[PDB]
Every structure is written in structure tokens, then in C-alpha cells.
Design an enzyme around this catalytic site. Sequence first.
Site: not given
Ligand SMILES: O=P(O)(O)C(F)(Cc1cnc2ccccn12)P(=O)(O)O
Ligand SMILES: [Mg+2]
Ligand SMILES: [Mg+2]
Ligand SMILES: [Mg+2]
Lengths: 337, 337
Positions: A44, A85, A90, A94, A99, A161, A187, A226, A230-231
Site C-alpha cells: 500500500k 527485508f 518473516d 511464519d 504475500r 514473537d 515488532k 496497526f 493486522d491480527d
Molecule cells: O501478518 P504479517 O504481515 O505476516 C506481520 F504483521 C509481519 C510483521 C509485523 N511486524 C514485523 C516485524 C518484522 C517482520 C515482520 N513483521 P506478523 O503477523 O507476522 O507480525
Molecule cells: Mg508473518
Molecule cells: Mg511474524
Molecule cells: Mg499478521
Amino acid sequence: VYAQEKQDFVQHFSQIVRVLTEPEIGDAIARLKEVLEYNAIGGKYNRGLTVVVAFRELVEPRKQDADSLQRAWTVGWCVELLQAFFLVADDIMDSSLTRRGQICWYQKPGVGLDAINDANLLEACIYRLLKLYCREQPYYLNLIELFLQSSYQTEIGQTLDLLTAPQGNVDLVRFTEKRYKSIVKYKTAFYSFYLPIAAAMYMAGIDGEKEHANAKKILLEMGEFFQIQDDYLDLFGDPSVTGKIGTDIQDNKCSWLVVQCLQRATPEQYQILKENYGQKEAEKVARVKALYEELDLPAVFLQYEEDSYSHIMALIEQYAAPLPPAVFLGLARKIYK
Amino acid sequence: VYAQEKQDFVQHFSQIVRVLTEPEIGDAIARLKEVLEYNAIGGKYNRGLTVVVAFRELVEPRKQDADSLQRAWTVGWCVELLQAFFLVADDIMDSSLTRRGQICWYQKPGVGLDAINDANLLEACIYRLLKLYCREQPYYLNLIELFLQSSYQTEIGQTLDLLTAPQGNVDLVRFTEKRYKSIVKYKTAFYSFYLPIAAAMYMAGIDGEKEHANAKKILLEMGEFFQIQDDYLDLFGDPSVTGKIGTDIQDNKCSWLVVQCLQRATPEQYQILKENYGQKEAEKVARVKALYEELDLPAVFLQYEEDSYSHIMALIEQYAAPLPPAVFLGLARKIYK
Ligand SMILES: O=P(O)(O)C(F)(Cc1cnc2ccccn12)P(=O)(O)O
Ligand SMILES: [Mg+2]
Ligand SMILES: [Mg+2]
Ligand SMILES: [Mg+2]
Ligand SMILES: O=P(O)(O)C(F)(Cc1cnc2ccccn12)P(=O)(O)O
Ligand SMILES: [Mg+2]
Ligand SMILES: [Mg+2]
Ligand SMILES: [Mg+2]
């Protein structure tokens, strides 16, 4: 105010790639181009755009020459590379599938774990751009230290995390609001919206400790919202809109959802969560989602988004001065859309 | 001259860990300590020691106060952390089993791909130490840029390494001396011995482009030898001594060995190599090693090590001045032992 602003920013991507991708290392430079094109576009662009918009709002046009403007969008692209990066790595850690509306980079046959180094190259590109475009400026060292410290803070948060979300192990007792808040502060809050505005402030000559701290008060709270959004969306959002498939339940994550679930669950409901959370089977994941629906967590989130927006507005009133409120208001508009 | 020098350096590790590992992020800081302890010790310490020894040789004792000495060993520990960051990631990408006489960090049950972030934290520790101990010094920015550029160069070399060594695909035609030399220059020569001596030179106030370039002429060639020796030992060294199991044949790597093999092989021998290289089966790996023995590659390597040592000595005579020759001689002693 605009999506015209956004298109103007995105138009500079080709120039950023060009300057990063100018004989023996040729094959490596081409791979670099391939990593940039796949991973730095398709989101975005708010974080990087924020540098450009904030810089414009903090510096008089009689100082905004062609070179100054270019430095601003270059640093905005640096914030985008930092995000890129981190997301590449991640997604590996994960076990993610998609993505930005395509298969995760490391899922491509032919890429795999070589994505580890590809991520490290995106990180390096930030400091290459800073050297190429900002090295003679008085804020150069400030910008380098801001990107380095932001990255270290993000990495500490990633650690938290991952430690709170072990595979194969029940970790419900650790899933508390107090732990949740610490995880998301590190994070996400530093690198999402603090970083770009702090960068613009440095570029504008605003280097004071107090003004940075006041900005931080607003921006970390925006970032914590934010991450909660996301969660929520991991499970309740439409992947055709978010561009990614959620993994939090299967990954045993300390999500805002599971925290809110634990706060409201009866003992019977605690056992349902214990028996089904943190496991790959689709039927088990489905049972957790049904529990969350039974507990009206989508309504709890709606109420939280309202309460949060009001709080962030009140922090803008407390802490924005002497910066223009619009610096923070335009971010809030985009985040709470 | 000494291993007393080495013990003195290694004794500072506890202090480095202590200062990096001082409430909410506590669990993450403990994981950091665990990553440092497992991954930053157990090797030979030459790269980091080199900063200390070189600094002593380049600065008059009437300037070497307690604080100056501490900065030197701290920067030496920074070079060790850079190596540690890179090796953690490399072992994942190379599918390695052991390192420094123990199982690779990512092979530990409980670690796995979370080692990706653990490596990123070791990298961050370098810039934390630079800020804590060097931030008021005139060379601070020089040191930051040297570590960043070294890392970007190493990452380009890793890219080349990985592109030339695809899984599942014959890549013999690409395994040329010309490609080999480019890979090792980037993936090893910058960060192994150039980096530590350049750091010491900056710390001593030696910041001139010409003096750095002359030092580079010597040190990159030392590093290219070091990688050729690494490639020889992957297969011919004793893992009880090297502390690691080799993977180059199974990983389809552009090793010095396969390059030398291709130079000497008959057509029949080319087909043996084609049919057996770059595959997991032990019987196939054994066939390649037999070929290398048939072609007397251990003797070719012995002759190369002699020729290389003489060349590096001649470069010391050409390019060392005005630095003390002993700066380079002590490195050569250790490398060609
Ligand atoms: O849902 P996403 O984008 O995978 C995520 F928000 C990505 C993310 C949020 N904060 C970071 C910090 C580093 C790498 C990925 N990040 P996550 O749910 O894994 O925690
Ligand atoms: Mg993730
Ligand atoms: Mg993550
Ligand atoms: Mg997430
Ligand atoms: O044999 P090792 O130690 O795995 C090796 F020397 C490690 C290594 C050399 N140069 C780098 C650069 C980055 C990461 C690991 N590096 P490689 O044989 O993988 O190439
Ligand atoms: Mg390796
Ligand atoms: Mg390797
Ligand atoms: Mg090797």
C-alpha cells in the site's frame, strides 16, 4: 489528502531499481533486481509515502529544491526496503503461503532458503541509497542510526514473537495483554510509523530529543493499533483484499484475538482453545474461529478500533505541537480508514 | 607472534556479552545471550585478534590508554560478530550439519528457521557496540560505513555462490577459474582479512584512499587463498580439526576442487563428474572424491599453497609501505601455518 501523492511516489520505483542495479557481479545484480521487483512492490506504500508527505509539511517550499525532494522520496523508498527485508524473512519463519497477492518469495521453486540472503541484500540497499543521496547532508549519521536502531528494536520484537509462539508446545498461560503489548511495541511500532516520521523530522533539521519523544508518544500507539488490526484481519479479513493467508492459529501466535479470547473464555472454552490452538489441522483451526465468533470478538474489535481512534486523536492534541497536526492526522486517516 | 595475545582477546568475550545483555524485553535478551554464547565462540579468533594486534602496531603506546585499548578489542569483537551472523545463515543455506565442533545452531531442535532472526540480531550487535564505545571518535562513521559496505560485498558474493550452485541442475560449464575468482573475492576476501586491518587503520587515523587501496591489494589475495584452503579442507580436512562436515559436492558448489578437476579431466572423467556431482547420495560423492584423488588434486593444492605464499610475500614487499611489514607478516604466518 491524496492517491495522486501515492502514484507520484510509486513512479520513482524504477529509478530506485535503476540506480541500485548498475562486470563480474552482473549475475548477482540481476538477482538483486529480481528480488526488488518481486518483494518491494505490491503493498500500500503508506510508510514510504509518509516520509515524502511529512517532509513537505515540515520544510518551506523555498527550501524544497529538486535534489531535496529526491532525497525525501529516496528515504521513503528506504523505509519500504526495510519493510521488504523483514517481510521476506518473516514469511519463512511464519510458514506463510502468500504475500501481496502472490506466492511468498521463498515458496517459489528455485528460491527456497536462498531467500535468507536475498533479504539481507534488501537491507543492504537501504544504506547504499543513504550513501548515494544523503552522505553530504547534516542528518546523514542521524538517518543511519535511526534505521539501524529501528531494525534492532524490530528484531527484538521478532524474538519475542517467536519465543512466545513455540511449535508443538501449549503456551496459553503466556498469552497476556501485558506480553502482547510488549511484543507489538517492538515488532511493529518502531518500524511502521515512528521510523518514517522521525526520518522526515531529521531531514527537516528537527533533531531535538524532546520533539522526537513527543512524536513517538503518538506514533507508537498508532503502530500498536496497526498490529491489532493486522491480527484481526489474519482471520477475519478477506485475502483478496489483504493479499495474504493467515497463519496465526496454526503458528501458536500471541495474537490480539487469542488474548481477547482468554479474557472472556469459560473453563470449558479454555479447554476448547487448549485442545485446538497452535496445530496444523484445518478442523482444529475451524474450532478456534468458531469460538472467537461465539465470543463476539469481531464486535469487540469494532469497539476497540473506535476507542483507539479517539485515544490517538487525544494524543495528537496533547503531543503534536509544535509540528503541524496534519502530519499525524493524515496518518490516522489512512490507518483507521 | 602469540597465543597469549589470543587468550587475552578471548577473555573479553564475557564483557562483550555482559554489555549487550542488560524489563519487558528480558526473555528476548536472554535468547540473545544464548545466540552469542553458541555462535560467537569456538573458532580460531584470528579476524578479531587482528584488529587488536594491528591497532597496537599502528599506534604509539603513548596514545594507547585503557579506553583506546578497549575500543580496539571491542571492534575486534565486532568483526567476530559479523562472521557469526554470516555463518549462522550460511549453514542454513548450505544444509550444513556441524560448525565449530557442535551441531549447527539451526539444526537444534527448538531453533530451526528462527535462526534467521537470531542471525539478524548478531548483525545488529555490531552497530550497538560501535555506538556504545566509538560514537565520539573521529573514525566512527568510517567504521560504520566499512562494516556496512563489507556486509553488502559479502552478500553479493553469497548471491554468486548460490546462483552458480543450483540444486537439481548440472552447472559444470559455469565452473571456471574466472567465475571462481569473482565468487571468492566477494564472498570471502572483503570480510575476512581486509575488514579487520582496514578497521585498525581507521582507528589509527589512517584514512587515506591510497593507503587503503595498497592494503587491499595484499589482503584480498590473502582472502582468496583462505577460501581455496577452505574448499580443499571441505573434503580433505579432518573434521575433528576443522570442526565442520563438508557439503560442497552434495550442494553442487563451484569449489576450487571442482574447477581444478574440470581443468585436468579427460572426456570420460568429465562424464563421471557430470553423473555424480551435486547429489545427496553418498556413493556418488565418493566417486567424485576418487576422481579428485586420481587427478592428484591434494598435490596440486600443496603446490598452490607454496606458490600463493610466495606471491603474497611479494605483494607485501610491493605494497606494505609505509605500514610496518609485520602487520601483514603476522597474518600470513597464521594463514599459511
Ligand atoms: O501478518 P504479517 O504481515 O505476516 C506481520 F504483521 C509481519 C510483521 C509485523 N511486524 C514485523 C516485524 C518484522 C517482520 C515482520 N513483521 P506478523 O503477523 O507476522 O507480525
Ligand atoms: Mg508473518
Ligand atoms: Mg511474524
Ligand atoms: Mg499478521
Ligand atoms: O565452509 P564454510 O565455513 O561453510 C564457508 F567458507 C563460509 C563462508 C565463506 N564466505 C562466507 C560469506 C558469508 C557467509 C559464509 N561464508 P563456504 O564454504 O560456505 O563459503
Ligand atoms: Mg558453508
Ligand atoms: Mg556457503
Ligand atoms: Mg567451505
